[PDB]
Design a protein around this ligand. Structure first.
Ligand SMILES: CC(C)CCC[C@@H](C)[C@H]1CC[C@H]2[C@@H]3CC=C4C[C@@H](O)CC[C@]4(C)[C@H]3CC[C@]12C
Ligand SMILES: CC(C)CCC[C@@H](C)[C@H]1CC[C@H]2[C@@H]3CC=C4C[C@@H](O)CC[C@]4(C)[C@H]3CC[C@]12C
Ligand SMILES: CC(C)CCC[C@@H](C)[C@H]1CC[C@H]2[C@@H]3CC=C4C[C@@H](O)CC[C@]4(C)[C@H]3CC[C@]12C
Ligand SMILES: CC(C)CCC[C@@H](C)[C@H]1CC[C@H]2[C@@H]3CC=C4C[C@@H](O)CC[C@]4(C)[C@H]3CC[C@]12C
Ligand SMILES: CCCCCCCC/C=C\CCCCCCCC(=O)OC[C@H](O)CO
Ligand SMILES: CCCCCCCC/C=C\CCCCCCCC(=O)OC[C@H](O)CO
Ligand SMILES: CCCCCCCC/C=C\CCCCCCCC(=O)OC[C@H](O)CO
Ligand SMILES: CCCCCCCC/C=C\CCCCCCCC(=O)OC[C@H](O)CO
Ligand SMILES: CCCCCCCC/C=C\CCCCCCCC(=O)OC[C@H](O)CO
Ligand SMILES: CCCCCCCC/C=C\CCCCCCCC(=O)OC[C@H](O)CO
Ligand SMILES: CCCCCCCC/C=C\CCCCCCCC(=O)OC[C@H](O)CO
Ligand SMILES: CCCCCCCC/C=C\CCCCCCCC(=O)OC[C@H](O)CO
Ligand SMILES: CCCCCCCC/C=C\CCCCCCCC(=O)OC[C@H](O)CO
Ligand SMILES: CCCCCCCC/C=C\CCCCCCCC(=O)OC[C@H](O)CO
Ligand SMILES: CC(C)(C)CC(=O)Nc1c(F)cc(C(=O)Nc2nccs2)cc1F
Ligand SMILES: CCCCCCCC/C=C\CCCCCCCC(=O)O
Ligand SMILES: CCCCCCCC/C=C\CCCCCCCC(=O)O
Ligand SMILES: CCCCCCCC/C=C\CCCCCCCC(=O)O
Ligand SMILES: CCCCCCCC/C=C\CCCCCCCC(=O)O
Ligand SMILES: CCCCCCCC/C=C\CCCCCCCC(=O)O
Ligand SMILES: CCCCCCCC/C=C\CCCCCCCC(=O)O
Ligand SMILES: CCCCCCCC/C=C\CCCCCCCC(=O)O
Ligand SMILES: CCCCCCCC/C=C\CCCCCCCC(=O)O
Ligand code: NA
Length: 388
């Protein structure tokens, strides 16, 4: 058996490398939001809460994991605290990710009341509540659900520990039934699945809205053709009444309101002629609608489409971040499941525990990269911060 300081040297060096990069990248995220008012919105207050959690992974959770890798003698509840603290930060991350998903759902499903409903003041209070709940959930073992009543006395004596002390190792103090049923199933898997459901609803809502935009445009152009080849005033009137309802339905900024004003007025003009039995005059008046459509309506159509595509792009970036949290944390949770549910299976070997721990920690590095690669306003602010 090779000297343990050699393998732990590699593990510890990698942990420290991750801690440095987790602190630097997420400090940059927080600085960017602090400095750029275009980045100061409710979505990005949850982004900052998530960056703060990742900063604390570098400042506290990684030094704690390095300390625990030594198995040093410690009062059992002190060991328990440094072992559980990373769970607080993971839980807070989950609350932030779920809040971000819900925020984007509200923005796409009910844009007209988003600004009245989702305010910065309410967001700060939500963030404070979620941090309190993260402490309660992550430190729940400190309330008595722990293995400190059954210390491994042979291991403690072999290391020369003193009274009330244990060799400090995560699995000796944190119960695995808490880790699997309460932390993983209830507090991690369930929120991640709820997030998956929110994102499905976001993309379905976008796809449906971009469909309805295209439907109204098609109805407008189809009914223009119907009028042109109509044969009596009654047919002209039928198509015009559909167009009028569809115009108001698409009405639901000054040049925008002017263009629809023109449009509905021109439909009313032609409809009045059609009811008077003046087919040719009604058809000629309807042809004027094509001038309004080119100058105004199509511009509104293109801008509505472009706004929806930007909402889709923003939601995908947020979903990538949630998906990467899952990818990085799941191996460690799955290993706990094997330890717990398969007592006939040999425990995952030490090199694999190390690997799964640093994979989980690497998730605290990756978000600033996603923001830089996918969000212009962050990328340009990062550049100004780094340059200046
Ligand atoms: C505001 C921040 C920076 C302060 C951080 C304080 C941290 C480092 C403190 C808070 C409580 C402390 C623990 C409390 C009790 C014990 C039991 C002892 O047998 C070994 C040390 C150990 C495990 C301590 C390690 C350091 C510790 C985790
Ligand atoms: C911002 C400030 C107030 C942080 C407050 C955290 C304090 C109150 C908590 C955090 C961790 C706690 C320690 C965790 C574990 C142990 C080991 C146990 O054998 C005696 C108590 C002791 C030493 C606790 C004392 C209280 C403690 C230090
Ligand atoms: C989330 C995505 C990346 C899936 C990752 C799956 C990983 C975590 C899976 C795939 C194969 C699994 C291993 C397969 C067999 C064993 C041997 C057993 O005696 C201990 C657990 C152990 C070592 C498993 C640990 C978990 C494991 C490494
Ligand atoms: C997408 C979501 C649902 C991922 C969560 C799936 C998890 C909970 C699944 C993936 C593979 C599963 C493991 C596959 C094999 C075994 C070995 C068996 O002797 C006990 C159960 C155990 C250890 C399973 C426990 C549950 C498990 C870890
Ligand atoms: C302590 C642990 C981490 C510090 C993280 C603290 C993060 C604070 C950043 C403040 C910020 O960037 O937000 C300003 C806000 O947008 C103005 O309305
Ligand atoms: C011993 C271990 C103790 C370790 C310290 C505990 C840190 C706890 C919480 C930090 C939370 C910081 C959250 C910052 C979010 C900032 C934010 O989003 O601001 C919104 C803005 O104010 C809208 O108006
Ligand atoms: C700068 C960083 C220093 C980290 C120092 C960490 C020092 C930890 C000593 C290594 C050690 O004692 O490792 C125990 C090993 O697992 C045998 O069981
Ligand atoms: C800006 C600063 C922000 C705050 C920065 C916080 C840094 C915490 C660092 C390391 C935690 C190490 C955990 C404590 C290591 C314990 C070693 C020990 O206690 O030795 C006991 C042994 O039994 C002999 O008595
Ligand atoms: C803000 C910056 C925070 C400064 C504290 C930083 C690191 C603490 C390192 C932990 C030091 C642990 C030494 C433990 C030790 O020496 O243990 C001997 C053993 O108990 C037999 O005597
Ligand atoms: C906008 C500002 C957001 C930051 C908000 C501040 C963070 C709240 C920290 C609470 C620690 C105490 C909670 C203790 C609950 C569990 C304690 C325990 O279980 O031991
Ligand atoms: C939701 C908001 C958080 C509620 C906090 C109240 C928690 C009460 C503080 C619990 C004190 C923990 C304690 O001292 O428990 C020692 C016991 O021996 C266990 O092992
Ligand atoms: C969604 C996630 C909840 C998943 C529900 C999973 C319920 C698991 C029940 C179970 O695993 O049964 C215990 C087994 O007997 C072990 O000894
Ligand atoms: C389980 C998670 C697997 C990876 C998720 C991912 O990377 O994709 C992000 C998002 O779903 C893509 O739009
Ligand atoms: C999402 C959660 C869903 C399923 C996890 C269920 C895992 C249940 C594993 C049960 C394992 C078991 O029963 O082990 C018996 C042992 O092999 C002696 O025969
Ligand atoms: C590697 C050792 C065995 C030599 C020391 C040790 O016990 N290290 C350790 C640690 F510091 C943190 C965790 C941890 O965070 N596990 C989680 N599972 C799900 C969410 S967090 C697991 C660990 F094994
Ligand atoms: C990407 C995520 C990981 C980044 C870098 C990972 C590489 C190495 C860290 C794994 C530590 C392995 C320790 C081996 C020593 C041993 O077997 O005891
Ligand atoms: C542009 C560069 C950004 C800053 C770079 C900082 C580099 C820090 C990286 C790794 C720290 C490695 C220290 C290794 C000492 C551990 C010794 C041991 O295992 O006992
Ligand atoms: C991950 C690493 C990103 C680090 C890039 C350099 C930015 C650090 C400077 C700072 O904002 O404090
Ligand atoms: C290790 C570092 C731990 C904490 C780092 C947190 C830094 C994050 C964001 C910076 C925001 C502070 C606001 C100062 C504003 C000064 C100014 O506007 O001129
Ligand atoms: C920005 C400030 C961040 C804080 C710096 C702290 C980093 C130190 C890293 C690891 C601490 C390791 C704890 C030592 C274990 C003791 C081993 C033993 O006692 O047997
Ligand atoms: C704040 C920056 C941290 C300052 C110094 C890092 C040196 C920590 C020394 C390691 C002690 C652990 C040990 O002796 O085993
Ligand atoms: C440890 C398990 C979780 C604990 C469950 C119950 C603890 C807290 C419950 C609810 C917090 C709800 C916040 C409502 C505060 C009122 C704010 C307002 O004025 O509108
Ligand atoms: C590359 C990272 C590791 C890849 C896949 C994990 C599978 C390794 C299985 C190790 C089993 C060891 C054993 O139980 O004897
Ligand atoms: Na995180």
């Amino acid at each position: 058996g090779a000297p343990p300081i050699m393998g732990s040297s590699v593990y510890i060096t990698v942990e420290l490398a991750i801690a440095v990069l987790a602190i630097l990248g997420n400090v940059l995220v927080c600085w960017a939001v602090w400095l750029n008012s275009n980045l100061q919105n409710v979505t990005n207050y949850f982004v900052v809460s998530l960056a703060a959690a990742d900063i604390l992974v570098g400042v506290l959770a990684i030094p704690f994991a390095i300390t625990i890798s030594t198995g040093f003698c410690a009062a059992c509840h002190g060991c328990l605290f440094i072992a559980c603290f990373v769970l607080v930060l993971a839980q807070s991350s989950i609350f932030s990710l779920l809040a971000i998903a819900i925020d984007r759902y509200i923005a796409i499903a009910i844009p007209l009341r988003y600004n009245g409903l989702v305010t910065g003041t309410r967001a700060a209070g939500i963030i404070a509540i979620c941090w309190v709940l993260s402490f309660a959930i992550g430190l729940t073992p400190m309330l008595g659900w722990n293995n400190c009543g059954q210390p491994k006395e042979g291991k403690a004596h072999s290391q020369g520990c003193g009274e009330g002390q244990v060799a400090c190792l995560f699995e000796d103090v944190v119960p695995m039934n808490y880790m699997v049923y309460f932390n993983f199933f209830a507090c991690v898997l369930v929120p991640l699945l709820l997030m998956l459901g929110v994102y499905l609803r976001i993309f379905a809502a976008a796809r449906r809205q971009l469909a309805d935009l295209e439907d109204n445009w098609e109805t407008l152009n189809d009914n223009l053709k119907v009028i042109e080849k109509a044969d009596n005033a009654a047919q002209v009137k039928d198509a015009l009444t559909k167009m009028r309802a569809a115009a108001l339905d698409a009405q639901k900024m000054k040049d925008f309101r002017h263009g629809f004003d023109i449009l509905v007025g021109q439909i009313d003009d032609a409809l009045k002629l059609a009811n008077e039995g003046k087919v040719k005059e009604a058809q000629a008046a309807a042809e004027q609608l094509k001038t309004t459509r080119n100058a105004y309506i199509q511009k509104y159509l293109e801008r509505a489409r472009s706004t929806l595509q930007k909402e889709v792009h923003a939601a995908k970036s947020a979903a990538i971040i949630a998906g990467l949290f899952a990818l990085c944390w799941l191996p460690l949770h799955i290993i706990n499941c094997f330890t717990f549910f398969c007592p006939d299976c040999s425990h995952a070997p030490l090199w694999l525990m190390y690997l799964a721990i640093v994979l989980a920690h690497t998730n605290s590095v990756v978000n600033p990269f996603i923001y830089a690669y996918r969000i212009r306003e962050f990328r340009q602010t990062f550049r100004k911060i780094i340059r200046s």
